[PDB]
Amino acid sequence: PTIAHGDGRRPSKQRTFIVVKNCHKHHISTEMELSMLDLEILHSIPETP
């Protein structure tokens, strides 16, 4: 909005602002390691100790 004045200033006629904001897209990557020599036995069933 604006403010009417008594004196004659160059009056601002209903200014309308449109701003936009973009997304700061950024990601996270972790690093797990696993050795495969014990991964064949997780799908199977145990019978020997």
Partner: protein, 50 residues
């Protein structure tokens, strides 16, 4: 121990390990959390790397 006829302004940097106090208002930003998706890398000689 004599004057060389030349004066020397001597600058110097200084790293200060300060601790900063952050303040933000309530609910200014909004986070969007994706779902964690897995992928595989090169299999090393000891292990595979997820």
């Amino acid at each position: 121990k004599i004057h060389p006829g030349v004066a020397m302004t001597v600058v110097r940097t200084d790293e200060i390990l300060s601790e900063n106090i952050l303040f933000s208002s309530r609910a200014s930003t909004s986070m969007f959390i994706g779902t964690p998706n897995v992928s595989r890398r090169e299999a090393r000689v000891d292990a595979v790397t997820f």
